[PDB]
Amino acid sequence: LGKDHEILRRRIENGAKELWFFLQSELKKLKNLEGNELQRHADEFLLDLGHHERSIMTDLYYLSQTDGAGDWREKEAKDLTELVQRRITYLQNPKDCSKAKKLVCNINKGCGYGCQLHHVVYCFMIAYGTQRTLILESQNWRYATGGWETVFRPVSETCTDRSGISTGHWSGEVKDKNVQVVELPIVDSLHPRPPYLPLAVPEDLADRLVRVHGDPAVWWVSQFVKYLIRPQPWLEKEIEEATKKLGFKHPVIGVHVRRFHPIEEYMVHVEEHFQLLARRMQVDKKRVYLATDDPSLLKEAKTKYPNYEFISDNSISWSAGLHNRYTENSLRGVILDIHFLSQADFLVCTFSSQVCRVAYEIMQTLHPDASANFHSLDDIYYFGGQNAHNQIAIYAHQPRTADEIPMEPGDIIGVAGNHWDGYSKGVNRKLGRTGLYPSYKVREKIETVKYPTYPEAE
Amino acid sequence: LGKDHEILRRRIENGAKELWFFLQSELKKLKNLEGNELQRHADEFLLDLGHHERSIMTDLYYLSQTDGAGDWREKEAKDLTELVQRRITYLQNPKDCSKAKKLVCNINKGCGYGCQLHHVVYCFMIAYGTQRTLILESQNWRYATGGWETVFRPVSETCTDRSGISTGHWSGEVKDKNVQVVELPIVDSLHPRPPYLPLAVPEDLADRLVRVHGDPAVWWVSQFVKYLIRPQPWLEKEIEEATKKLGFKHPVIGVHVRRTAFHPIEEYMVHVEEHFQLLARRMQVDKKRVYLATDDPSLLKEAKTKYPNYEFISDNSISWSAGLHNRYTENSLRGVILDIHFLSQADFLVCTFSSQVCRVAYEIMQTLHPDASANFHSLDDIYYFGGQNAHNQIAIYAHQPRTADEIPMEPGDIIGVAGNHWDGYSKGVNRKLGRTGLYPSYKVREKIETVKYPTYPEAE
């Protein structure tokens, strides 16, 4: 046992105990107050509770790093991603492309870039589960009519055509067993649905992922996002150029405001996380990378928060003007916004937005475990077309109001979202009742699927 | 890293985060309430907070045990005890008693049993640090005039005689280097004071102690209590007989109510009930049992009627099991020994640490578990040893006072702690500023003190 590990564990334990002592005393005094004197004491109470709670979270962070734990998690998370990327590269590059089993995906889904990119991810994951090389068709792509390879590297180096003896639309893995080239439609009306969909994770990787990562579902999704967005050299140059031009530097918190939530809703979580980071590092300046579709928000945020340095992409052209002809005008902004949001140390946004979801997923590829480096103002993490997200009640709950649902340990709860107020909303599937329940009284139900493991990739 | 260790660490982290969400939401609702709506909401707020807080503590307990941590902590605590007890046994049993350096302690201090036992402990710790065999003088002991050896084993098997070529009262370890037999007085007016006193721990054990125990100071004190209270075979049979006669079984919480400051029984039982609610999260509590030791003869009846679901066990004996032993021990010694025993054997201790008896029980409790430093709640004082050196802390987070009763602090300020008010604030002196007042208990860290004790390597 590590000495620092035990010191930190006891201070976390005693810190939470002193917090319980503090809460009982101040709440007792709070009961004998009225009116304006009650307002001040409650506000001072909350300010004192914030620093106390952040000291517990700080010791918890030190605990996750102490006695070689941080180095092991970086090493283990690096081996897991290198294993998956090697499996994907092996699948994507068969020796003879003319006799390879293939799955065809068309990027031209009737939606925006964030939704279109998630379409190819859902394509890629199903291709991975069916042992089919992913062939991406992207002619007349709305963001770059030259195709996908105009911006990113091709999804394969040896097999990029759709030649084969037989071709058919998706109708089932067993039914399409002897169909060489299977065309996959959008997830909206896919039938039959294979098991190779979020939020399940590969059964052969589940034990190692749960040990290393707080949300293995996003990590699995992120491995296909990571492979897809391997940039062409010109784009890699542009990204490095924008980093120098914009002065993107750490520490920095990414904020994505899609437009309704005022800027103050986003900033109260930015200010709170900067106070947390200040407990364990020097914060030279509070930096926020602002990505928004509201052009009047940048000047609103700068004047409302004069002690914050706001970094944002306002360019009307690529660094090299030659690239303006091959990419649609709005592709530059979304690629840069998603990049810098994914590079940030913390992400404040709304997970109902595809753009923040993509940035959150890429963030998981840049750190051993960045599952908690976010705060969404509405939805929890999800993937379009995922199977049902279920939780398991660990502690009993008896409803206080009619809006709450009862829970017994072992009950399967289908969560709709987290209200970030101590309660979550969902359906108790054992009863068919939908309502609120304490968020701490449930745990996540991690699903697994028997994927191919591709032993030849070694 | 172990999988359960990582799952528990995250659930503790996420459980604390959801607690912060819950606190922010409900406190914002409380700001817009009046009268009975405010009272009823806060009470339901407290009830929800308690269960939520106990789930975090429960996960923290599981964290302390996962992936072989519990078994390792037990074997390491066992090795540290057997090492110290070997060193004490080696010192106390020299081959040639006539030539051995000695320290003479007289048990007949003008105070009660708890105070007298701690006097010998303070003797034994100094004798350990000065490499002198402890010679215990206990004739006309007010609890057993036949001597200390009437109840417990003698402190030595080979050297209980006080012969030496020279003798003198304590005048300092340097001046007494050639005084073979040194008489040590009470700690009250001891001059000069040696470094072998609480709350410092031996520096050769300090690293392993901090790694394994939450309060190494009590553990170091408990080693000398453990060696002294080695019972004679008849006392060992009495304790075994009283255990069966009282029905003492686990789980059980020890409660000591000394009333000769007054605390109502509810002041103790709120922490008794809270700890049983905690234990009910990780074990099936067949019955809420309490061992009650008190100097108030009417309290046992009061506790039974006010808490009908509790099984109250207490010492009520008028004599030993074997009546022969009544003739050699004073009547009150039986109750104190049995109370200290069963309080120390309890899974949790609720009392007032200003009472010597509860402190003795808390110290002995440390010899019964790997780390029982947190298995208590005192209604007043924090732990202390009579005559200890200044108990200091180190401020780790800055504090700006809100009221005139608070003191400011900066990281690194040595804080002399006077006590913990158990309301989030402690009371002490900022020695840098010379100011005394309140400060948040979580903003300071314990300052562990070390002393170069002899290590007695020949004892291996």
Side-chain angles (χ1 to χ4, degrees):
Chain A
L1 261 183
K3 165 179 158 184
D4 300 308
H5 179 279
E6 300 303 287
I7 292 178
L8 294 170
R9 175 183 57 80
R10 289 190 230 108
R11 189 187 299 162
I12 294 163
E13 190 175 60
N14 185 250
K17 179 142 57 178
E18 291 291 348
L19 184 70
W20 178 231
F21 286 153
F22 185 61
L23 284 170
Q24 290 172 295
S25 175
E26 299 298 333
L27 271 178
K28 168 178 173 54
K29 304 155 61 182
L30 189 143
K31 295 174 63 176
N32 286 91
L33 296 181
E34 289 167 291
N36 233 323
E37 189 181 4
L38 170 62
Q39 303 295 294
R40 175 186 298 268
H41 184 278
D43 288 348
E44 301 172 335
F45 193 17
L46 275 166
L47 265 59
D48 291 358
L49 288 174
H51 298 302
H52 195 154
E53 180 266 355
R54 282 187 285 277
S55 71
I56 295 178
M57 304 301 287
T58 298
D59 294 331
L60 279 166
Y61 167 77
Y62 288 150
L63 177 64
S64 69
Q65 305 294 308
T66 189
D67 290 304
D71 290 325
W72 178 90
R73 193 177 300 104
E74 180 189 19
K75 155 77 167 178
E76 174 71 6
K78 209 174 183 182
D79 290 332
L80 286 170
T81 178
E82 285 179 1
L83 170 66
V84 175
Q85 297 306 311
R86 172 158 24 90
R87 291 175 171 180
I88 300 177
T89 300
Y90 166 84
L91 164 67
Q92 283 306 103
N93 295 268
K95 182 173 180 178
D96 186 49
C97 184
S98 59
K99 292 193 173 186
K101 292 282 182 290
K102 304 172 178 179
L103 177 140
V104 176
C105 190
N106 195 280
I107 200 181
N108 294 318
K109 190 176 180 181
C111 59
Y113 175 84
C115 155
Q116 285 187 346
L117 180 58
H118 281 150
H119 171 66
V120 187
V121 173
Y122 136 87
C123 281
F124 219 156
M125 190 176 297
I126 290 186
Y128 182 90
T130 58
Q131 303 181 251
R132 293 180 176 274
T133 300
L134 172 64
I135 278 74
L136 181 62
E137 288 183 2
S138 56
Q139 287 194 325
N140 297 119
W141 188 26
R142 56 183 305 176
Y143 296 102
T145 43
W148 168 267
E149 10 282 317
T150 296
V151 185
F152 304 100
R153 279 218 280 169
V155 301
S156 174
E157 297 286 320
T158 71
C159 197
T160 57
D161 61 271
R162 57 180 301 157
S163 64
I165 309 177
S166 58
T167 297
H169 304 274
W170 173 278
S171 65
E173 183 172 359
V174 178
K175 198 189 307 294
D176 300 331
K177 171 178 175 295
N178 291 131
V179 185
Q180 184 174 352
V181 178
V182 166
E183 295 168 331
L184 189 69
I186 60 177
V187 73
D188 299 7
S189 298
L190 177 66
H191 181 266
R193 292 166 53 89
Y196 320 112
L197 295 178
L199 297 169
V201 301
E203 151 184 307
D204 71 279
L205 299 177
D207 189 288
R208 292 174 64 179
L209 283 178
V210 176
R211 180 183 304 153
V212 73
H213 200 272
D215 193 348
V218 193
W219 188 94
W220 179 235
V221 165
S222 66
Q223 298 307 304
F224 296 92
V225 186
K226 174 185 181 63
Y227 189 98
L228 280 175
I229 63 170
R230 291 167 304 116
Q232 292 283 12
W234 77 264
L235 178 69
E236 181 171 39
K237 166 68 170 298
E238 288 284 336
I239 294 177
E240 179 190 17
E241 273 299 303
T243 305
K244 176 182 179 179
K245 182 175 186 177
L246 301 180
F248 190 78
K249 192 176 174 300
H250 293 283
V252 56
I253 299 185
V255 173
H256 183 269
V257 179
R258 190 189 66 166
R259 296 181 182 180
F260 175 83
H261 299 275
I263 185 57
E264 293 84 350
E265 258 197 77
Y266 299 85
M267 286 290 110
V268 294
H269 307 89
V270 173
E271 182 62 55
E272 185 172 3
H273 188 76
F274 264 131
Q275 293 177 279
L276 177 68
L277 292 176
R279 276 196 158 270
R280 74 203 194 203
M281 72 179 300
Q282 294 251 72
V283 179
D284 53 354
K285 192 73 182 298
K286 305 183 224 173
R287 269 179 289 270
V288 167
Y289 184 83
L290 187 62
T292 178
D293 54 317
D294 189 357
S296 63
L297 182 58
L298 178 59
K299 293 304 298 175
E300 179 192 342
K302 289 180 61 179
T303 43
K304 283 187 178 181
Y305 301 86
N307 295 319
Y308 270 79
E309 172 184 328
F310 289 93
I311 302 175
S312 60
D313 171 62
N314 305 123
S315 62
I316 60 182
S317 159
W318 293 101
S319 182
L322 173 61
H323 306 134
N324 296 330
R325 322 145 80 104
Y326 300 99
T327 57
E328 197 266 346
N329 204 331
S330 69
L331 184 60
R332 176 185 59 258
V334 60
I335 289 185
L336 289 174
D337 278 341
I338 290 180
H339 171 77
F340 291 114
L341 286 172
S342 67
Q343 292 279 337
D345 307 302
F346 199 73
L347 186 53
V348 179
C349 77
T350 50
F351 269 175
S352 64
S353 311
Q354 295 252 6
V355 163
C356 189
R357 246 175 293 147
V358 174
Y360 174 66
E361 289 158 355
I362 303 171
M363 186 177 65
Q364 307 310 308
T365 70
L366 304 173
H367 307 278
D369 182 8
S371 54
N373 291 33
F374 78 97
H375 183 91
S376 160
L377 297 189
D378 46 25
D379 296 312
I380 63 183
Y381 177 83
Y382 69 97
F383 186 90
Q386 68 185 26
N387 289 317
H389 184 177
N390 282 319
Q391 294 168 330
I392 301 178
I394 57 185
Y395 313 134
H397 178 71
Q398 313 294 346
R400 174 173 283 104
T401 59
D403 303 286
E404 304 182 17
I405 52 166
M407 292 191 305
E408 291 288 326
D411 288 355
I412 301 178
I413 284 82
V415 55
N418 186 327
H419 292 181
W420 322 112
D421 57 357
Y423 293 95
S424 300
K425 191 168 67 177
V427 48
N428 192 321
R429 306 196 178 279
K430 189 188 63 178
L431 307 178
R433 289 180 56 178
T434 299
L436 302 171
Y437 57 93
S439 298
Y440 86 98
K441 294 192 177 183
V442 302
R443 68 175 173 88
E444 294 295 307
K445 188 182 188 302
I446 296 179
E447 305 288 352
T448 64
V449 169
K450 177 190 274 289
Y451 277 81
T453 64
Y454 298 93
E456 303 82 1
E458 304 306 271
Chain B
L1 280 175
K3 182 173 66 180
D4 299 322
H5 176 276
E6 293 305 290
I7 296 176
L8 287 170
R9 180 188 52 76
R10 290 196 226 97
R11 192 192 303 165
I12 293 162
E13 197 175 272
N14 184 254
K17 183 176 299 179
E18 294 291 346
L19 181 64
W20 180 229
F21 288 155
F22 185 61
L23 284 171
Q24 291 178 266
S25 171
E26 298 300 322
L27 282 179
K28 287 170 179 57
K29 301 179 180 181
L30 283 176
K31 301 209 304 177
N32 312 324
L33 292 181
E34 302 174 347
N36 274 323
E37 285 192 359
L38 173 64
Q39 313 283 280
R40 193 178 82 259
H41 191 107
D43 292 333
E44 299 177 350
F45 193 17
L46 279 173
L47 294 180
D48 296 338
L49 285 178
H51 297 303
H52 194 154
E53 185 266 354
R54 281 187 288 278
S55 71
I56 294 176
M57 302 296 293
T58 298
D59 290 326
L60 275 163
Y61 166 78
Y62 291 150
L63 185 69
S64 69
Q65 309 288 312
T66 32
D67 296 305
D71 292 334
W72 181 92
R73 187 177 299 103
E74 187 172 38
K75 302 302 293 181
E76 176 73 357
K78 189 185 307 170
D79 287 328
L80 287 173
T81 302
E82 296 171 349
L83 175 67
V84 170
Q85 297 301 319
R86 269 190 284 99
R87 295 176 177 177
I88 296 177
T89 299
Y90 171 85
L91 170 69
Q92 286 302 116
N93 296 269
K95 288 172 285 185
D96 192 354
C97 186
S98 64
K99 303 284 171 55
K101 296 276 170 281
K102 302 174 183 179
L103 190 151
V104 173
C105 192
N106 196 314
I107 199 184
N108 294 287
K109 188 176 178 177
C111 56
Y113 173 85
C115 160
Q116 286 190 340
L117 175 58
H118 280 152
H119 170 66
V120 187
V121 170
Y122 138 86
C123 282
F124 219 160
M125 190 169 295
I126 292 184
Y128 183 88
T130 62
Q131 297 171 269
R132 296 177 178 272
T133 294
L134 175 62
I135 305 296
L136 182 54
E137 289 291 305
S138 56
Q139 267 303 320
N140 273 110
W141 187 25
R142 35 170 303 179
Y143 295 102
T145 54
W148 171 263
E149 18 278 305
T150 306
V151 194
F152 308 101
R153 285 183 64 178
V155 303
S156 176
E157 299 288 336
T158 74
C159 199
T160 60
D161 187 84
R162 323 196 320 275
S163 291
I165 199 176
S166 49
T167 307
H169 297 289
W170 176 279
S171 59
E173 186 180 3
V174 183
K175 297 183 178 182
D176 301 331
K177 190 173 68 175
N178 292 120
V179 186
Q180 182 171 347
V181 177
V182 172
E183 290 180 285
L184 184 72
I186 59 181
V187 74
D188 303 10
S189 294
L190 174 65
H191 184 82
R193 289 165 56 91
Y196 319 114
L197 294 175
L199 296 164
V201 299
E203 66 160 334
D204 66 283
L205 305 172
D207 186 77
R208 295 171 62 182
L209 281 179
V210 176
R211 182 187 297 106
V212 85
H213 196 272
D215 195 343
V218 194
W219 183 95
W220 178 237
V221 163
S222 70
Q223 294 309 297
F224 298 92
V225 178
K226 172 182 176 64
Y227 186 92
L228 286 171
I229 65 181
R230 292 168 303 119
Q232 293 283 7
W234 73 265
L235 180 65
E236 197 178 35
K237 190 185 74 63
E238 293 287 332
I239 299 173
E240 179 187 355
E241 239 289 313
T243 307
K244 200 191 70 174
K245 190 159 177 287
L246 293 177
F248 188 84
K249 40 180 158 57
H250 297 271
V252 54
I253 294 187
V255 176
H256 181 252
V257 181
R258 183 186 58 84
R259 292 178 171 175
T260 65
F262 181 84
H263 298 276
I265 188 58
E266 297 80 10
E267 215 158 294
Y268 301 87
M269 289 292 136
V270 292
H271 307 94
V272 177
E273 181 61 52
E274 193 174 337
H275 189 77
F276 269 121
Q277 287 175 296
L278 179 65
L279 294 177
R281 290 191 155 269
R282 65 212 195 200
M283 70 183 301
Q284 214 274 314
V285 176
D286 60 333
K287 183 73 173 180
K288 292 190 290 186
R289 274 178 294 267
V290 162
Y291 186 86
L292 180 65
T294 174
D295 55 341
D296 192 338
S298 66
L299 178 60
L300 182 63
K301 168 184 175 185
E302 188 195 311
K304 276 159 158 283
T305 50
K306 290 189 176 182
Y307 304 88
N309 305 288
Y310 276 86
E311 171 182 331
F312 286 100
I313 313 176
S314 62
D315 167 64
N316 53 338
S317 61
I318 198 185
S319 161
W320 294 103
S321 181
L324 169 65
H325 307 116
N326 295 328
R327 310 169 186 269
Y328 306 104
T329 57
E330 200 266 359
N331 192 18
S332 67
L333 182 64
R334 177 189 59 257
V336 179
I337 289 180
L338 289 179
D339 281 342
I340 293 183
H341 170 78
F342 288 114
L343 289 176
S344 68
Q345 292 282 332
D347 302 294
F348 199 74
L349 186 51
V350 180
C351 78
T352 54
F353 266 180
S354 55
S355 313
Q356 302 246 18
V357 169
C358 187
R359 295 205 305 275
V360 179
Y362 174 70
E363 290 155 354
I364 299 172
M365 174 182 295
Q366 307 307 317
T367 66
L368 304 173
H369 313 280
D371 180 11
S373 59
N375 296 19
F376 81 99
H377 182 90
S378 163
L379 296 199
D380 42 43
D381 292 305
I382 64 179
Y383 178 77
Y384 71 94
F385 189 88
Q388 68 186 23
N389 283 317
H391 181 181
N392 283 321
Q393 295 165 329
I394 302 182
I396 52 182
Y397 312 132
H399 179 65
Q400 165 67 29
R402 178 173 288 103
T403 65
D405 303 286
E406 303 177 33
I407 52 167
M409 292 191 313
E410 296 296 327
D413 285 355
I414 293 179
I415 310 295
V417 52
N420 192 323
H421 286 189
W422 319 114
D423 59 354
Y425 293 90
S426 296
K427 190 160 178 285
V429 45
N430 189 330
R431 303 192 185 277
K432 184 184 71 176
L433 311 176
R435 298 178 57 180
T436 304
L438 303 170
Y439 58 97
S441 303
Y442 86 99
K443 291 188 177 186
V444 303
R445 179 241 309 174
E446 284 299 316
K447 174 172 171 58
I448 310 293
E449 308 284 8
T450 54
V451 166
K452 188 188 187 68
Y453 277 81
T455 64
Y456 302 97
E458 296 89 351
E460 307 304 315

Short mmCIF file of all heavy atoms in Angstrom, two decimals, chain B residues 376-395:
data_model
loop_
_atom_site.label_atom_id
_atom_site.label_comp_id
_atom_site.label_asym_id
_atom_site.label_seq_id
_atom_site.Cartn_x
_atom_site.Cartn_y
_atom_site.Cartn_z
N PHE B 376 -14.77 6.52 16.91
CA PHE B 376 -15.20 7.21 18.11
C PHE B 376 -15.92 8.49 17.73
O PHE B 376 -15.81 8.98 16.60
CB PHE B 376 -14.02 7.54 19.03
CG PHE B 376 -13.27 8.78 18.62
CD1 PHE B 376 -13.52 10.00 19.23
CD2 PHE B 376 -12.33 8.73 17.60
CE1 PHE B 376 -12.84 11.14 18.84
CE2 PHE B 376 -11.65 9.86 17.22
CZ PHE B 376 -11.90 11.07 17.84
N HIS B 377 -16.67 9.02 18.69
CA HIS B 377 -17.12 10.41 18.65
C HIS B 377 -17.15 10.94 20.08
O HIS B 377 -17.90 10.43 20.92
CB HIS B 377 -18.49 10.57 18.01
CG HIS B 377 -18.94 11.99 17.92
ND1 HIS B 377 -18.67 12.80 16.84
CD2 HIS B 377 -19.62 12.77 18.81
CE1 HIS B 377 -19.17 14.00 17.05
NE2 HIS B 377 -19.75 14.01 18.23
N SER B 378 -16.34 11.96 20.35
CA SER B 378 -16.29 12.61 21.64
C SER B 378 -17.20 13.84 21.64
O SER B 378 -17.25 14.58 20.66
CB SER B 378 -14.86 13.03 21.99
OG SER B 378 -14.84 13.99 23.03
N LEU B 379 -17.91 14.04 22.75
CA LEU B 379 -18.80 15.19 22.85
C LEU B 379 -18.07 16.48 23.18
O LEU B 379 -18.63 17.56 22.96
CB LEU B 379 -19.89 14.93 23.90
CG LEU B 379 -20.88 13.79 23.63
CD1 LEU B 379 -22.13 13.96 24.49
CD2 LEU B 379 -21.24 13.72 22.15
N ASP B 380 -16.84 16.41 23.69
CA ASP B 380 -16.07 17.62 23.95
C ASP B 380 -14.68 17.55 23.33
O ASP B 380 -14.50 17.89 22.16
CB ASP B 380 -15.98 17.91 25.45
CG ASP B 380 -15.72 16.66 26.27
OD1 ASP B 380 -14.88 15.84 25.86
OD2 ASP B 380 -16.34 16.51 27.34
N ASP B 381 -13.70 17.12 24.12
CA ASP B 381 -12.30 17.22 23.72
C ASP B 381 -11.96 16.26 22.59
O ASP B 381 -12.60 15.22 22.39
CB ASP B 381 -11.39 16.94 24.91
CG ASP B 381 -11.46 18.02 25.97
OD1 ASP B 381 -11.26 19.21 25.64
OD2 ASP B 381 -11.73 17.68 27.15
N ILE B 382 -10.93 16.63 21.82
CA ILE B 382 -10.28 15.71 20.90
C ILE B 382 -9.37 14.82 21.74
O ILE B 382 -9.30 14.98 22.96
CB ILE B 382 -9.48 16.46 19.81
CG1 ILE B 382 -8.33 17.25 20.45
CG2 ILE B 382 -10.39 17.39 19.03
CD1 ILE B 382 -7.48 18.00 19.45
N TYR B 383 -8.67 13.89 21.10
CA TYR B 383 -7.77 13.03 21.86
C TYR B 383 -6.60 13.84 22.40
O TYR B 383 -6.10 14.76 21.75
CB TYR B 383 -7.24 11.88 21.02
CG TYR B 383 -6.27 11.01 21.80
CD1 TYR B 383 -6.73 10.10 22.74
CD2 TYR B 383 -4.90 11.14 21.62
CE1 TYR B 383 -5.85 9.32 23.46
CE2 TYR B 383 -4.01 10.36 22.35
CZ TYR B 383 -4.50 9.45 23.27
OH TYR B 383 -3.63 8.67 23.99
N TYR B 384 -6.17 13.49 23.61
CA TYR B 384 -4.98 14.06 24.21
C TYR B 384 -4.48 13.11 25.28
O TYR B 384 -5.22 12.26 25.77
CB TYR B 384 -5.25 15.45 24.80
CG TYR B 384 -6.10 15.43 26.06
CD1 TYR B 384 -5.51 15.41 27.31
CD2 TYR B 384 -7.48 15.43 25.98
CE1 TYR B 384 -6.27 15.39 28.46
CE2 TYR B 384 -8.26 15.41 27.13
CZ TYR B 384 -7.65 15.39 28.36
OH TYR B 384 -8.42 15.37 29.51
N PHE B 385 -3.20 13.26 25.62
CA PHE B 385 -2.59 12.54 26.72
C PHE B 385 -2.15 13.55 27.77
O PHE B 385 -1.55 14.58 27.42
CB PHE B 385 -1.41 11.70 26.25
CG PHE B 385 -0.86 10.76 27.29
CD1 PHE B 385 -1.39 9.49 27.45
CD2 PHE B 385 0.17 11.16 28.13
CE1 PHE B 385 -0.90 8.63 28.41
CE2 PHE B 385 0.67 10.30 29.09
CZ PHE B 385 0.13 9.04 29.23
N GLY B 386 -2.47 13.28 29.03
CA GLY B 386 -2.12 14.19 30.11
C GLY B 386 -0.63 14.49 30.17
O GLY B 386 0.18 13.57 30.28
N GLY B 387 -0.27 15.76 30.08
CA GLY B 387 1.12 16.16 30.06
C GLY B 387 1.78 16.12 28.70
O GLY B 387 3.01 16.22 28.63
N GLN B 388 1.01 15.98 27.63
CA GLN B 388 1.58 15.94 26.29
C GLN B 388 2.22 17.28 25.94
O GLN B 388 1.92 18.32 26.54
CB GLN B 388 0.49 15.62 25.26
CG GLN B 388 -0.54 16.73 25.11
CD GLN B 388 -1.69 16.34 24.20
OE1 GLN B 388 -1.97 15.16 24.01
NE2 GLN B 388 -2.35 17.34 23.63
N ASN B 389 3.11 17.25 24.96
CA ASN B 389 3.61 18.49 24.39
C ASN B 389 2.53 19.15 23.54
O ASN B 389 1.46 18.58 23.31
CB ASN B 389 4.87 18.24 23.56
CG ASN B 389 6.10 18.02 24.42
OD1 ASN B 389 6.33 18.73 25.40
ND2 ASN B 389 6.91 17.03 24.05
N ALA B 390 2.83 20.36 23.08
CA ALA B 390 1.86 21.14 22.31
C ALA B 390 1.40 20.38 21.07
O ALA B 390 2.21 19.97 20.24
CB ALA B 390 2.48 22.48 21.91
N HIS B 391 0.09 20.19 20.97
CA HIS B 391 -0.51 19.55 19.80
C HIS B 391 -0.71 20.61 18.72
O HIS B 391 -1.55 21.51 18.87
CB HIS B 391 -1.83 18.88 20.18
CG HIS B 391 -2.51 18.18 19.04
ND1 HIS B 391 -3.72 17.54 19.18
CD2 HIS B 391 -2.15 18.02 17.74
CE1 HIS B 391 -4.08 17.02 18.02
NE2 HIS B 391 -3.15 17.30 17.14
N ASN B 392 0.05 20.51 17.64
CA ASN B 392 0.05 21.51 16.58
C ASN B 392 -0.50 20.93 15.29
O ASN B 392 -0.47 19.72 15.05
CB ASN B 392 1.46 22.06 16.35
CG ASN B 392 1.87 23.07 17.41
OD1 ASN B 392 1.07 23.88 17.85
ND2 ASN B 392 3.14 23.01 17.81
N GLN B 393 -1.01 21.83 14.45
CA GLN B 393 -1.49 21.51 13.11
C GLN B 393 -0.81 22.44 12.12
O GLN B 393 -0.14 23.41 12.49
CB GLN B 393 -3.01 21.63 13.01
CG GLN B 393 -3.80 20.65 13.85
CD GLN B 393 -5.26 21.04 13.98
OE1 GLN B 393 -5.59 22.23 13.97
NE2 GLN B 393 -6.13 20.05 14.10
N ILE B 394 -0.99 22.14 10.83
CA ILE B 394 -0.45 22.96 9.75
C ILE B 394 -1.60 23.36 8.85
O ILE B 394 -2.28 22.50 8.28
CB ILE B 394 0.64 22.22 8.96
CG1 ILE B 394 1.78 21.79 9.88
CG2 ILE B 394 1.16 23.10 7.83
CD1 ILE B 394 2.91 21.08 9.17
N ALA B 395 -1.83 24.67 8.72
CA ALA B 395 -2.86 25.16 7.82
C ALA B 395 -2.47 24.86 6.38
O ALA B 395 -1.35 25.15 5.94
CB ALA B 395 -3.07 26.66 8.01
#
